[PDB]
C-alpha cells in the first residue's frame, strides 16, 4: 500500500498498553539490578580473594557478553530441563542480571571518583577505613552514583525492547500485533520509535534537572 497513520489511531490502546509494559519491565529489572549490583560490588571489595574473584568474573562476563544471548540462555536454554519460565519473568531475570553487573561497576567507579585527599584527611585524623568510609567517602560517592543510576535506567528503557523477540507484549511487540490486522509494519514502527524517543527525552531532562538539584 502507501502510508496511512490514521488507520493506526484505532490501535492507540495497544501502543499505550505496550508502553506501560516497557516501563514496568525496565523499572523492575533495574530495581532488582541495583540491589543485586550493590551486593556484587561489596563482594568485590571483600578481602577474601575467592569472593572478589567471583564478583569480578560475574561482572566481566555479564558485561563482556550480549544481552540477547543472556535472554535466550534463560528462556530457551532452560527448557530442556523441564523448566518453562514465562516470557515476563525471563526478561526480568535477564535484564536485572545484565543491569546488576553494569551497576556494580557504576558504584565502584563512583567511589574511585571521590578525590583520594578526602580519605587521606579522614585517616590522618585518626579515623579507620570503616569510619572514613561511613562518614566521608560513601556519602560523596552517592552523589556520583545516583545520576549514573538514573542514566542506567534510561539506557535500559531502550534495552528492554529485546524481550519482544521472546514474545513478551512490550512496546516493540505491538507492531507485530497491529500488522496482523493491518498488514502494515512501517507506521506502527515509526510510532513506536517515536514513543521511545519521547520517553528518552523526558527521562533525560528529568535526569539533568536532578544533577542540578545536587550541584
Amino acid at each position: 500500500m502507501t502510508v496511512d497513520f490514521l488507520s493506526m489511531v484505532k490501535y492507540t490502546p495497544l501502543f499505550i498498553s505496550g508502553l506501560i509494559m516497557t516501563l514496568k519491565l525496565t523499572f523492575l529489572a533495574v530495581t532488582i539490578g541495583v540491589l543485586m549490583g550493590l551486593f556484587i560490588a561489596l563482594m568485590k571489595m571483600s578481602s577474601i580473594k575467592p569472593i572478589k574473584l567471583v564478583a569480578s568474573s560475574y561482572i566481566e562476563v555479564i558485561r563482556g557478553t550480549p544481552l540477547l544471548v543472556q535472554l535466550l540462555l534463560i528462556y530457551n536454554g532452560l527448557m530442556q530441563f523441564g523448566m518453562n519460565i514465562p516470557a515476563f519473568t525471563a526478561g526480568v531475570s535477564a535484564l536485572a542480571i545484565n543491569s546488576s553487573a553494569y551497576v556494580a561497576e557504576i558504584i565502584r567507579a563512583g567511589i574511585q571518583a571521590v578525590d583520594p585527599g578526602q580519605n587521606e584527611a579522614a585517616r590522618s585524623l585518626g579515623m579507620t577505613h570503616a569510619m572514613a568510609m561511613r562518614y566521608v567517602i560513601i556519602p560523596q560517592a552517592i552523589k556520583n552514583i545516583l545520576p549514573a543510576l538514573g542514566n542506567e535506567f534510561i539506557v535500559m528503557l531502550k534495552e528492554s525492547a529485546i524481550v519482544s523477540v521472546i514474545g513478551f507484549a512490550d512496546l516493540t511487540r505491538q507492531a507485530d500485533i497491529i500488522q496482523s490486522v493491518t498488514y502494515r509494519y512501517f507506521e506502527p514502527y515509526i510510532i513506536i520509535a517515536a514513543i521511545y524517543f519521547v520517553m528518552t527525552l523526558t527521562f533525560s531532562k528529568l535526569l539533568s534537572l536532578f544533577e542540578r538539584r545536587l550541584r
Binding site: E120, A121, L125, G126
Partner: protein, 240 residues
Amino acid sequence: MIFVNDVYKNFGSLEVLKGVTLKVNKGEVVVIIGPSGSGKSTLLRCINLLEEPTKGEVFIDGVKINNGKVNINKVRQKVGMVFQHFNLFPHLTAIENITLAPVKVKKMNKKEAEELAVDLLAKVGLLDKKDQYPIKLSGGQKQRLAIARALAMQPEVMLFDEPTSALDPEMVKEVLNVMKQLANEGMTMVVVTHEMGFAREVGDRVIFMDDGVIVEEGTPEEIFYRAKNERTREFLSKIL
C-alpha cells in the same frame, strides 16, 4: 619523638627517596626545602604513613610504625597533617568538619566537641563561618579551617605539606600567621614550604633536599647566609 631512619621510596622505576634520615624532638620547628623532585613531601608523608617506605624504618614515640605490628589509627591521632589542597569535607559544615573526628574517634560528646570547635574557630579567626560550608570559603579560610580541624584532635606534632602554595598571594600571610602562632606556643612542627620567611622568622632548623636526598641542614641563618654545599647555593640563588 620522630625518627625516620635511612628510608628509601620507589614509585615503580621512579626513585623518590634514596636513603633519608630525620630526627625531630618535641618543640622543634623543622622546615624542609628544595626543588621539585627533591622528595621533601614524600619524606613528610612517611612520618604519618600516608606513604610507605620501601626500605628503612620510621619510629614515633620510640616505636616502629612501618612493620604492621601497630594500630596505625592510634598513631595518626598523634600526628596531624595539613594538606596543600585543603581536603575539607564538602558535605560537612565548618564546625562539623572540626568535630567529626573528636566525636567519632575520641568519643567526645557533642557539647564538649562543639565548645572545642568554637574555641578553635575563634583562634584561627573563623567564628563567623561556623555554619558555612567549605565551598563558601576563600583559600585562606579553607586552610585556616583545616588547621582548626587538625588541632581539634590535639596532636603532639603537626605536619604541613606546602600549606600556602595553592593560595593566592593576598592569602598566604594569614595562613602563615596561624602557623607562626602555633610555633610560638611550642607546637612541634615539620613544614615543607616555599615561604622562606616562615623559616627565618620561626624555624629551628632548615633541611635542604635535592634529588631524593638531604644534602645540607643547619639553622635558618646558617643555610640562608652561609650554605656550604654547591647545590644548596644554586637552589637558593634561584629561589631567594
